[PDB]
Amino acid sequence: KIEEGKLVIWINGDKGYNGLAEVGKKFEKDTGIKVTVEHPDKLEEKFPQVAATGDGPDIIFWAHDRFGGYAQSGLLAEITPDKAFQDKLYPFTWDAVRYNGKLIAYPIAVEALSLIYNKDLLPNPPKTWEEIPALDKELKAKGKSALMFNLQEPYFTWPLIAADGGYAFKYENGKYDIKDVGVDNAGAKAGLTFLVDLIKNKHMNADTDYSIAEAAFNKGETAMTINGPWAWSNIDTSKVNYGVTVLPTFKGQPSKPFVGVLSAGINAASPNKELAKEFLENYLLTDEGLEAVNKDKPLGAVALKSYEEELAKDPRIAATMENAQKGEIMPNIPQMSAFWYAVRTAVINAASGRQTVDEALKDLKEKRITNTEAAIDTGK
Ligand SMILES: OC[C@H]1O[C@H](O[C@H]2[C@H](O)[C@@H](O)[C@@H](O)O[C@@H]2CO)[C@H](O)[C@@H](O)[C@@H]1O
C-alpha cells in the first residue's frame, strides 16, 4: 500500500528528475511532506500492473498518449482544477490529456523531435532525406557518419514513415477509428523502404539504440542525430558545437513527428490526492518549479503560458515547435499501447532483414495489431 503523508513520483530517466527533486525539497520545506522522485526502468509498462496491485507511485509522469489507457483501467484519479488555473496553461495542451470528455492529468510541457546537427563539420545541413546517403560517403572518408538515431523505438522513425501520409488511426472530426489503420499505405511503406535502404547500403546500423546514438553525436563521431529537447543538456556539457533545425523532407513532403505532452497523472489508489494536487498546481506548474526541472534537462515548450513566453526566445524551442506544427499530436486512446508495441516489432524486423518491408507492415496491419490488442485485454 502507498504511504499516507508522503509523495512518490515516477518519471523516465531521460527527463530532469534531479530538478524535480529540488521542487520536491522546496515542497518538503513548506509542507513537511517528504517527496521521493524515482525513475525506474520501463515505468510505462511497470505502472499499470503495479497500480492494479499493490499500488506504486502517487504521481506518474509520461507523455499523454498512454494516459487514456490508464484512465480506462480506472488507475488515474480524476483531477479538478478550476478555470482560473486552466487559463494559466495553453488550451491545446489541455485538449491533449482530455479523455472521454474529462480531464485525467496535469500537462507539463510539449515535446517534438528535431534534427540535431554538428555545425563544425556540417555547417550546411541537408534539407532532404534523399541527400543523406551521398553525404554519408563524404563523411565516411573522413572517418565519421552522417546520421545516427534510435531505431529500436518507433517514435524516432515515425517522422519519416508519416511524411508521405502514413498515420496510426484515421480521425473523422474529434474522433479516431481503430478499424482504419494507415501503417500499410503507399506513404508508410515508402518511408520505411527508404530507411531500410539506408541500412542495406551501410549508411546506418540496425542495432543503433538511444545510448549508442547519443554517444556517437556527443563524442563528435556523427554529423547528425534525431532527438528531443531532453537530450540538449548532455550536448551542452559535451562542448559539441550544434544547432537544432527542421527535420529532413521526403519526396518534398516534411517529416511528421508524433508530438507528445509530458503530463503528470495522480494515482487513484493514492491517499495523498490533495497533496498531489497541491504539489503540481502550486509548486511544479509555476515559473519557479519549471525552471528547476528545465535547468536540469530541458522540457521544450512548456504548458504554463507565463514561463513559455520566456523560453520562446530560445531558437532551439522555435525549431521544436516548427517540427510540431508540421507533425501532429498523438492520440490518447487506450489502443496506443498495443499500437506502439506492434509497430516497434515491425520496424525492428524490417531493419534486421527478418521480414521485408511489405511483409512486416502487412503483418502489422492485418495480424499483429489485433493480436496485441487481445494480449493486453486478457492477462499476459
Ligand atoms: O517509441 C514508442 C514510444 O514513443 C513515445 O515515447 C517517447 C516519449 O514520448 C518521450 O517523452 C521520450 O520518453 O522518448 C520516448 C521514446 O522512447 C510514447 O510516449 C510511448 O508511449 C511509446 O511507447
From Swiss-Prot:
GO terms for cellular component: ATP-binding cassette (ABC) transporter complex, substrate-binding subunit-containing; outer membrane-bounded periplasmic space. The lineage of its organism: Bacteria, Pseudomonadati, Pseudomonadota, Gammaproteobacteria, Enterobacterales. Its main location: periplasm. Keywords: Periplasm, Signal, Sugar transport, Transport. Part of the ABC transporter complex MalEFGK involved in maltose/maltodextrin import. Binds maltose and higher maltodextrins. The keyword Signal applies. GO terms for molecular function: carbohydrate transmembrane transporter activity; maltose binding. This is Maltose/maltodextrin-binding periplasmic protein. The keyword Signal applies. The complex is composed of two ATP-binding proteins (MalK), two transmembrane proteins (MalG and MalF) and a solute-binding protein (MalE). Belongs to the bacterial solute-binding protein 1 family. GO terms for biological process: maltodextrin transmembrane transport; maltose transport. NCBIfam families: PRK09474.1. It comes from the Bacteria.
